[PDB]
């Protein structure tokens with residue numbers, strides 16, 4: 001086990017990967033945008049809070065501040081090319097609203113093909129270093145029945161995993177319940 | 179796609195799983211404790227910030243408040259049972275420090291057998307509903323060389339994945355860079 005003192009940004013900050021990327025959908029007037037966020041996480045069960053950490057550099061950043069509502073959608077391995085594409089181009093240069101999607105009960109756009117998605121109302125934004133954490137309260141839930149097991153989890157092997165710097169994967173079929 | 183409006187806590191809050199659990203290691207004098215946390219995420223690259231979301235119900239919670247420094251260690255599928263064990267018992271009733279570990283440069287405890295670990299200095303704590311987010315600055319990094327690839331990512335198939343409610347998995351060894 002090699003070790004070193006941190007002296008600035010790490011030569012790679014990928015030790016806690018892979019993670020599932022959340023597709024953040026935001027609408028301001030007629031303009032819709034999508035942005036994968038691999039820095040995401042549950043923050044509370046009661047009430048249900050979910051967090052995404054978005055750089056001020058993203059076009060999505062300014063949209064979320066304005067809209068104060070967004071979606072977070074979770075997508076099968078099969079949609080990795082679409083997910084990658086949405087994370088390698090900016091709403092500033094291309095209209096991501098053309099990606100097939102529907103609007104939710106609260107009118108946040110949700111990218112199609114998702115096994116599950118949340119609609120969120122923005123509760124708080126906190127700056128931590130060079131990204132902002134958007135804390136959302138889950139106000140509605142979407143699920144694709146025959147892609148989710150009983151307790152709410154996606155069928156093993158289904159989840160798109162992200163390893164960092166453009167590399168994707170998926171979980172194995174084999175699960176262990178000790 | 180079935181939907182419903184959230185009416186309180188979700189029947190299951192697992193739609194965004196699986197994730198890598200971070201084993202949080204903390205020391206207050208002689209007392210060492212370890213707690214897995216699947217609610218974890220990078221928060222900034224410059225400077226490198228890493229967050230874990232810990233319930234005030236955990237013995238680990240008061241230990242973090244006191245010590246203000248912790249480790250987040252990341253473990254191979256191999257150690258699923260030690261991880262589960264540490265996640266099913268409380269330091270209130272069993273001395274978790276008897277699990278094989280070493281102290282790091284800053285004197286935080288790190289659980290042995292990890293492919294990587296961070297040593298963190300606590301910067302802020304934020305209450306989001308029923309959990310507190312502990313934001314740590316990475317002050318040191320440990321890596322078991324060669325178990326990571328060249329960019330810092332753990333070799334495919336190695337990561338312990340958690341699906342929630344005592345179910346674990348691992349990534350498939352097939353990756354795609356689209």
Ligand SMILES: Cc1cc2nc3c(=O)[nH]c(=O)nc-3n(C[C@H](O)[C@H](O)[C@H](O)COP(=O)(O)O)c2cc1C
Pocket residue numbers: 021033034035036037038039040053054055057058059060061083084086087088089090091092131162
């Ligand atoms: C798999 C993946 C995960 C990503 N996760 C994040 C993240 O957590 N935070 C972030 O600020 N950017 C993240 N990005 C980068 C943004 O998605 C990317 O900059 C995107 O093109 C932003 O689009 P926008 O400018 O339309 O918002 C990610 C990109 C990819 C491909």
Ligand SMILES: Cc1cc2nc3c(=O)[nH]c(=O)nc-3n(C[C@H](O)[C@H](O)[C@H](O)COP(=O)(O)O)c2cc1C
Pocket residue numbers: 199211212213214215216217218231232233234235236237238239261262264265266267268269270274309340
């Ligand atoms: C895989 C796994 C992930 C967990 N993630 C979290 C988490 O993110 N936050 C939390 O408060 N508890 C989490 N727990 C529960 C604690 O790890 C568990 O309550 C543990 O016994 C705490 O022990 P302590 O009382 O010694 O702190 C998790 C448990 C498991 C098994």
Ligand SMILES: Oc1ccc(O)cc1
Pocket residue numbers: 038039055164165
């Ligand atoms: O802002 C980003 C955070 C994490 C990533 O993996 C990519 C971009």
Ligand SMILES: Oc1ccc(O)cc1
Pocket residue numbers: 216217233342343
């Ligand atoms: O406090 C907890 C958060 C998430 C989990 O999956 C388990 C415990």
